Structure 1
């Protein structure tokens, strides 16, 4: 059984996103599992943004072309290099770029590690299939009070579990990986801790996130209505529900 929670605080819509420093073109750290699970929090914290419901990542580097600077979708890049419908680009793909494209926070989306935390509120009892359509460069998803973070303790330092529900790595220089899926059985009305950790090491960043509900509904990119944050309250006695199927409910 995946451990779930019943936080009694004021619920806030969306996930908290923390940003951590990652070295441009570090082709090692991003593929290490200890780093993805907890090691990232050792790195300098750049900032955070709260209340985000649209959590898919799609960052496209600029092409500085003769008619202006425009983002280039990765599948339209060619040669050394240009972008279809724009011609040759005069800027390097291998430098840092600054922009707000990740959740409105000004940082270097070319090279950053994001930590997304919240609680997933299932509306139906049954098995949920989470999915990353692909990943550039690496990402994990963990779900559960024992594996994502502890109940009522969303904002604490990371727990030390490498038991990921999904983990994905783009091999360095390789093509984008295919779909990656992971299934969790969840009970309706319990808040399940959820953590996504995402790294971009250079240039393009991509992480299309979706979930398929037990009825076969698919929710893609925007998780409004499903993900919530609560401020930590370590004093709330009955926050943790080790097994929601045998939980003595008291009303």
Structure 2
């Protein structure tokens, strides 16, 4: 029933990133839609990183299988699964486009309908989460250029929040994750600050007095 709240002081910036183990040189699972949507969740977690507003990167170090990713040293970029999750807030009403470009090796994106909220004294609690059906799935052909640029545009309402999940896999060597936002003005952004949020948990016993 409520798609917004007066008190949203518990909203904080950024995607939450989870990095999972992935077998080096596996060019099969990157094309497997079940693996990209759910199967990856069974792998060992390597890192958890919050506060991420600039999600894109293009990393290749011929001399190291690790690199600094999202401010964290020694991340195993060479072979990994990355999951990014959060709530996208539309500022103004209009068509917003999410674009995945030249991905190496593969990525799948999920974008949900507007979340409802429970409104509490100390903040808002989003009720909807885990959209399960993907919109976009892009895969680099083995050993050839990824010329694919794939996008999803939809109308968003000013002030409303939409859950989003992006899954990215690097099987070996270069990790290229190019993820861009086009807002209704036509501006193209690689920085999601003031558009991407988490909602802090609160004590549901004291939601109201």
Taking structure 2 as the reference length, the TM-score comes to 0.82
Distance 1:232 1:26, change over 3 A: farther
* Number of positions where the alignment pairs a residue of Structure 1 with one of Structure 2: 194
| In structure 1, C-alpha distance between the alignment counterparts of 2:52 and 2:178, rounded to whole Å | 15
Distance 1:152 1:196, change over 3 A: same
Shift of 1:233: 6.1
Q: Please list every run of at least 4 consecutive aligned residues from structure 1 whose deviation after the TM superposition is greater than 3 angstroms.
A: 4-9, 150-154, 231-236
| In structure 1, C-alpha distance between the alignment counterparts of 2:3 and 2:136, rounded to whole Å | 21
- The reply to whether residue 124 of structure 1 matches residue 92 of structure 2 is yes
Deviations 1:61-92 (A, max 9, x none): 23x5xxxxxxxxxxxxxxxxxxxxxxxxxxxx
Picking from 147, 151, 161, the partner of 1:177 is: 147
| In structure 1, C-alpha distance between the alignment counterparts of 2:41 and 2:177, rounded to whole Å | 20
- The reply to whether residue 56 of structure 1 matches residue 56 of structure 2 is yes
Deviations 1:185-236 (A, max 9, x none): 21110111111110000000111111111221221x2111111112356959
Q: Is the 8 A contact 1:16 1:116 kept in 2?
A: yes
Q: Is the 8 A contact 1:119 1:194 kept in 2?
A: yes
Q: Structure 2: where are the runs of 5+ without partners?
A: 115-124
Q: Is the 8 A contact 2:138 2:148 kept in 1?
A: no
Shift of 1:34: 1.2
Shift of 1:153: 6.8
| In structure 2, C-alpha distance between the alignment counterparts of 1:38 and 1:234, rounded to whole Å | 30
Q: Structure 1: where are the runs of 5+ without partners?
A: 65-95, 237-251
Q: State the partner residue of 2:165.
A: 195
Q: State the partner residue of 2:109.
A: 141
Structure 2 residue matching 1:106: 3-state secondary structure: strand
Structure 1 residue matching 2:104: 3-state secondary structure: coil
- The reply to whether residue 111 of structure 1 matches residue 79 of structure 2 is yes
Picking from 189, 192, 195, the partner of 1:223 is: 192
Superposition RMSD in Å: 2.8
Q: Is the 8 A contact 1:19 1:47 kept in 2?
A: yes
Q: Is the 8 A contact 1:5 1:192 kept in 2?
A: no
Taking structure 1 as the reference length, the TM-score comes to 0.69
| In structure 1, C-alpha distance between the alignment counterparts of 2:134 and 2:102, rounded to whole Å | 16
Higher Cα radius of gyration: 1
